[PDB]
Amino acid sequence: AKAKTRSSRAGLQFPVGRVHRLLRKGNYAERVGAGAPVYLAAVLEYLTAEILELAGNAARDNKKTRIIPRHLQLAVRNDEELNKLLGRVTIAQGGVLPNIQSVLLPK
Amino acid sequence: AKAKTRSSRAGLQFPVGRVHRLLRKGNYAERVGAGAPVYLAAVLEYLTAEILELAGNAARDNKKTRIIPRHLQLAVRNDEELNKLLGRVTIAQGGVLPNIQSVLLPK
Amino acid sequence: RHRKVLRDNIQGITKPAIRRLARRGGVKRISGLIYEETRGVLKVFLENVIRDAVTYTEHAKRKTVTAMDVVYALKRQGRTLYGFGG
Amino acid sequence: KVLRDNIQGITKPAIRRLARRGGVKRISGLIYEETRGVLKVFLENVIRDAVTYTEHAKRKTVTAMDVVYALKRQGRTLYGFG
Amino acid sequence: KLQILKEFLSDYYFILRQFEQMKVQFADMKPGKRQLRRIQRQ
Amino acid sequence: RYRPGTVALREIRRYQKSTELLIRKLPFQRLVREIAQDFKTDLRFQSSAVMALQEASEAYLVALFEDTNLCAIHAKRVTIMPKDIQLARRIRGER
Amino acid sequence: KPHRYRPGTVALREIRRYQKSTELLIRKLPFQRLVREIAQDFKTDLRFQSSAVMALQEASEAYLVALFEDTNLCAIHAKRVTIMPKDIQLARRIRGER
Amino acid sequence: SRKESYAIYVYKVLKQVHPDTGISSKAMSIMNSFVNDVFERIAGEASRLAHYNKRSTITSREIQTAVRLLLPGELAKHAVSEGTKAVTKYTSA
Amino acid sequence: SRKESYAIYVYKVLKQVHPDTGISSKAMSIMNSFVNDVFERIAGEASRLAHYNKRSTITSREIQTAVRLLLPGELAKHAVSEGTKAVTKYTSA
DNA sequence: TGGAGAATCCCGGTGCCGAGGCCGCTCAATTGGTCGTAGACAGCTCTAGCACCGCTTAAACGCACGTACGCGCTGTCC
DNA sequence: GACAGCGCGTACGTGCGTTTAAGCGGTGCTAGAGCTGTCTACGACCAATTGAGCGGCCTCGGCACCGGGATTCTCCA
16 A cells, blocks of 8 residues: 555655656667666666765865756766766866866976 | 559669568567568669769779679768768778878988 | 848957967977968868758758757867757 | 787888888887787777677677677778678 | 794794785785775775 | 067967957948848847857867967978868868 | 989888778787787786687777877978877867766 | 568669679678668657657658758758659659 | 746755755756756667667666666676666666 | 889789579568558638837947967977 | 978068957847647558569670780880
């Protein structure tokens, strides 16, 4: 009677029902396995944590408490694996990492 | 009555029924209209014809009678449009277009 | 019902902005021959996208360009952007 | 039984054959190892995911379809192999 | 002396097996920071 | 007066630590309308669409400056010439 | 007086020979063996289609070819005629494989 | 079992352009792959298009647009031309 | 309309890691886009896989393997560990 | 500048199995039905896209000049 | 051929007043952004037939090859 969400059934934070619906409506296969949305939202939350944690690290590093896109760029580019995952990714108002080639420095 | 193939109905060479089945079995979308496989196959044959004409010209350019992959390569890389269409494509045994940059020749 | 035809806003691409662009690139010293080069190549990219942008617009039967149009175009060309829907 | 060190099986004459077919005239002596490493990298990536296809296929024999799928996903679609 | 060395070996056993598992855990030079994010995530 | 080039690093750091757009918006919008004129007439525009258009433009061109600068420094130079851009886009495959 | 061609014209000879040619430049078995060595790592006791071995190679050499031709573009723009690894790496930088 | 492919149509049309020319089997596989690829690319693109407009059905309209997308210029104008006549032919039939 | 996004979920997990930290609205939408693209890439690869082996239903094996093929090394290691944990927790409960 | 030598080139035989037809035979393409829903579409509303206006200010312009960078070449050596 | 040395002359960077035009709200203003009922017509699904495709099997024909004259790059002269 009292419903209990599949995400809670995994102690999970994204909605499994939502994602299951999207999977079914997304025309990928006619039939859907059950633990697939589970594993799916799980890895989603994983990456979410992985990225937001660095973003907050940066926000702290620049003495602010609200994360802004600049942090998003900084964190994405200062990772190797993430950036390779998002090497073809542009972020609006993101700027770049300040980095100077040694040759142009004065000496 | 006597059955007429849809391709014949367009004066076509590619199989409308075959393609239409492919589309249905591909799970690209939930419904398919009638004229789409026709339109697609027509574009297909146009493109194939273009390619084949160029490659036959190539084979004629070398006094042979059987088209080989090498002529495919030579023709396609000798086309601006096709090669941009096939720029991310490698052909087996294709080889290259012989091209020597100017400064590389003795002077 | 005012539908005029524009001309040479590519020279609306000011010299200082271009230099600023290079400076965000970390660029140190610059030819004068660079600038028109930039205008042209920029132009190239501009139509290359805007064409399919309009294609999206039209297949929607539509008369106005949506952002998601640009989104889908740039995604076609693998130029993924975040922050505008889509 | 173990295998090792066939990366040296890529000889200098083969290397400069490739370079020549590329239209290069003169070559540093340092090129060869550079090339071998780069090739190592390429081959490793491609085999890796090719295998990935193989196991999820629950087979124990790499197929040409797995190989083609891998380099097509990379961006170098190879025709001529079904 | 036999009892003494038995004591010695019991004393060693802890750190010895600790290395025995450290290698298994950290045979490769790896950015174990993410490995600790495994625990902090859980 | 400063020696020429230290100033350059000044704007380098200014603009590498900054993130705001670098282009006047009205010229951008005008150019866009010009370009769009060539495919269909009388087309109306989301402002935000224009904004993202711009953004994408700078991202493209900025990566262009980067790889061009790499090309030039390989040429042991510091001044950029169209040679470098042409080679760069050729290598990336645009030419 | 033994007859010797000047340094470099020969290279053009082979360049033309191979730019007209269309076949492999690599030995079969050493290549297969490298395949086997690398593939050892991910799973043990794998079998291979020979056709797969081939597909592997063609992919390889074609990739390599694009690499060297860009490398030559680098060198020529760099006002030299001998290739040096810095060209190779810089091109690899440009295309964007890290 | 059976293994379906395009080759017979390829040979028909080849005769339709160069009646005097043979063909390699490896080149035949090349072309088989070619058709495979182009079919797939265009079809997936169109499917996305349908999603973008929340449509559940495949028409030729999106196909026209999609070809406009993937082929550039004269390629596109030609292709839309033959497609236009061909669908005209089937419908008018 | 009843425009849907994942923002609240992001907000919760945000509080999970840095319980005292704000965020841009624009950056929030960026997060939406990111999660999206993740969804589509992985979904499309998976559906490819399903066609590939001639199976008709998407299960955990496929999704896991896809995670392998898209993610580079360590990220995949971590995610696969977690997915195993999570599917275990669901099925066990 | 002209010949000597090497390297190519071409062509008419000389082998040879791969295209190239070809043919039983079985299943997918075609055909005629029903059926319900998706999508066509105009209306209805209405949203955002556009045109226009002083006016100020920040940002682009003009230009000089000077300043250091590009560039040429050449021995030299590996 | 790569590399460095050096001098030189030019095209490029920094100030610096001087316009000037982008920006910025303030004001109208209309065109198409954004919807909702409603009613078919067209494909989805299914059911008789069948023909074309695919596979197996001959068969001969381009074509690689060979090797010998026949015809051009190269490199000192």
